[PDB]
């Protein structure tokens, strides 16, 4: 059983009464004006508790369930204000106990209905400089900085790349006042990352889950036979999971173990370049039976899965 259902607020609100014939109002519109509060002459909603951004590193995410739709508070004292019979805003009769002791997890949860979505922690401008100076000057490896500050190696590598862009921008006076104002505002809206805080630290043991292993194989062995991760790896014909983690930590450009030389074994010829020639020929050795465009290959151009790519200039090209 299903029918169309107008999305009325789940919480109680003041419905429309008898209306003058020319108002032509809706119960949805009046519920929104009650959520928003009065609009001043400047076009602002100062009474709504979400109109202005937080400035204390604590996100102000909507909590309709805990406040039962009461979104109005005094713009300076931050004291709850509710609608009364007179049509004015005043103190609530009873304090809301659900809004005074909120769990730590909920504070970082932006969407009431999804507790698996949480905001990330912003890194302070100091930790970023420390990470930048350790990888670049002191010459530490990304694996070391990752294991020290509790940050995943890709994030560590990204911080170095971004701090380099901020130096060039600051070296050419490209960071304007507005950009500085915006950056600081956004910094004071998110919980700052604390390398010492154990819970704030990012897990460093995560590996991609393969597909062949996703199945459930079971072995019946002797009651006192030892079976461990290495034995399981042999059964599943995969490298041990610890080895996978170690190989994934040596991928960072500044990480230890980064190596790429086994491929430098392909004969290449650069054709002679003569004055007046607009391009150079590069020849790459290949093998008959592998090189070439195959004959009778599937044409997908008229199919929904037609292959679309992008060239070096960023232009959309058919592959």
């Amino acid at each position: 059983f299903s029918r169309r259902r107008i999305a009325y607020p789940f919480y109680p609100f003041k419905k429309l009464g008898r209306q003058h014939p020319k108002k032509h109002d809706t119960n949805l519109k009046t519920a929104m004006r009650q959520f928003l509060g009065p609009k001043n002459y400047k076009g602002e909603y100062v009474m709504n508790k979400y109109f202005t951004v937080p400035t204390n590193h604590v996100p102000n995410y909507i909590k309709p369930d805990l406040e039962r739709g009461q979104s109005l508070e005094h713009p300076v004292t931050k004291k709850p204000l509710q609608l009364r019979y007179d049509g004015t805003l005043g103190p609530p009769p009873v304090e809301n106990k659900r809004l005074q002791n909120i769990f730590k997890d909920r504070l970082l949860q932006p969407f009431p209905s999804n507790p698996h979505c949480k905001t990330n922690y912003v890194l302070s401008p100091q930790l970023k400089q420390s990470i930048f100076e350790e990888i670049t000057v002191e010459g530490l490896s990304a694996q070391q900085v990752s294991q020290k500050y509790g940050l995943k190696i890709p994030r560590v590598e990204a911080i170095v790349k971004l701090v380099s862009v901020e130096n060039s921008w600051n070296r050419r006076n490209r960071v304007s006042s507005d950009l500085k104002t915006m950056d600081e505002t956004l910094y004071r809206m998110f919980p700052v990352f604390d390398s010492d805080a154990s819970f704030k630290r990012e897990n460093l043991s995560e590996i991609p889950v393969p597909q062949k292993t996703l199945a459930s194989r079971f072995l019946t062995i002797a009651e006192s036979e030892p079976f461990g991760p290495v034995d399981a790896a042999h059964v599943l014909e995969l490298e041990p999971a610890v080895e996978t983690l170690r190989n994934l930590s040596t991928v960072g450009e500044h990480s230890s173990g980064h190596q790429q030389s086994t491929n430098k074994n392909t004969k290449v010829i650069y054709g002679e370049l003569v004055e007046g020639e607009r391009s150079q020929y590069k020849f790459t050795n290949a093998k008959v039976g592998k090189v070439g465009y195959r004959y009778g290959s599937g044409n997908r151009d008229n199919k929904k899965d037609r292959r679309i790519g992008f060239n070096k200039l960023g232009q959309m090209v058919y592959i």
Binding site: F1, S2, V53, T55, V76, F111, V122, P154, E166, K312
Partner: protein, 341 residues
């Protein structure tokens, strides 16, 4: 793309990837997706309706069906068994729409470089977005781990900032601001003691959420906190604004205005050449949507971001930012697996 029609309808109450005021009320009043009493088809349809409204509404159904991938990606923490704390179940089905997160337009929205996915598309199409230094003008460009993308600073400020008022609109706000200032100078001069007493009591309830108290302490150092009759006398009355006289003449208007907070510039038009409200202030209702992604590292000073990885599901968490719970995404996944059968 699909034409944008009735995206912020209150009766439908669909939640969109935007910071719009009407879209905040729809999210505020939703109270979850109702799946009770519905047949399996009705449950699946409802889940599809809600999820697609948020995740890639601009994509046509047939295009989305092609893009949709049955394979979802999770990670295995190899230390869980070495902790001892109660393990949490991985929300695998919150990865149903993860394939969209690698799109350039979605990446811009998650980085807070645009106020909505729709705006992100227009920023990309108009030539304001670069990936790895190359200008990309196709919203459907897919990012790979490690890619860096940037947006022209003026566009990001226009998306995260307040709207620029027009000259006529901002000239009526200054008229009212002058009237309400001359009322504060007439109440300060008629009974200075009460006004100062009220002024001191207001600064006690600031809570430090209002930085005006910190600035006020400076002002008390610019002149024990005891009354001073020189204050009321110092206060002066601003001159009224004749909207008609200074109509169509901004330089004249911005020379007749001199308020203690707004001096020689019309409200919100300190630099009429800039494309946003000046001096720059955050857009209204930004806090409820300001979510920092786990899969991007953002540098707001330069408007640069790096695509760290494709969002993944882990015990107790999904990096795919969604306003809907796992049961809804599970139904949505069930629908698309079978092409809506």
């Amino acid at each position: 793309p699909r034409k944008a029609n009735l995206l912020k309808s209150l009766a439908r109450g669909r939640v969109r990837t935007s910071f719009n005021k009407y879209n905040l009320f729809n999210l505020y009043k939703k109270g979850g997706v109702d799946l009770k009493s519905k047949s399996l088809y009705q449950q699946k349809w409802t889940a599809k309706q809600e999820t697609r409204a948020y995740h890639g509404e601009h994509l046509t159904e047939k295009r989305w069906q092609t893009v949709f991938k049955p394979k979802l990606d999770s990670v295995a923490q190899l230390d869980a068994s070495l902790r001892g704390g109660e393990i949490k179940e991985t929300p695998f089905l919150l990865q149903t729409f993860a394939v969209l997160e690698k799109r350039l337009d979605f990446a811009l929205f998650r980085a807070m470089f645009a106020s909505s996915v729709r705006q992100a598309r227009q920023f990309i199409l108009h030539g304001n977005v670069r990936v790895n230094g190359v200008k990309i003008k196709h919203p459907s460009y897919t990012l790979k781990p490690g890619d860096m993308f940037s947006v022209k600073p003026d566009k990001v400020l226009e998306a995260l900032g307040a709207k620029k008022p027009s000259f006529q609109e901002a000239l009526k706000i200054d008229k009212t601001q002058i009237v309400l200032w001359n009322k504060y100078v007439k109440e300060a001069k008629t009974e200075p003691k009460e006004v100062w007493e009220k002024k001191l009591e207001n600064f006690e309830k600031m809570s430090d959420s209002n930085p005006k108290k910190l600035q006020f302490q400076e002002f008390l150092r610019q002149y024990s906190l005891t009354f001073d009759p020189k204050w009321a006398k110092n206060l002066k009355y601003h001159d009224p604004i004749k909207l008609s006289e200074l109509e169509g003449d901004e330089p004249k208007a911005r020379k007749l205005i001199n308020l203690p907070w707004q001096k020689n510039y019309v409200y919100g038009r300190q630099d009429p050449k800039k494309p946003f409200f000046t001096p720059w202030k955050p857009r209204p209702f930004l806090s409820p949507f300001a979510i920092l992604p786990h899969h991007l590292e953002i540098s707001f000073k330069t408007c640069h971001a790096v695509y760290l990885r494709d969002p993944v599901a882990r015990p107790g968490q999904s990096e795919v930012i969604s306003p809907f719970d796992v049961p809804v995404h599970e139904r949505a996944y069930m629908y698309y697996l079978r092409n809506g059968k």
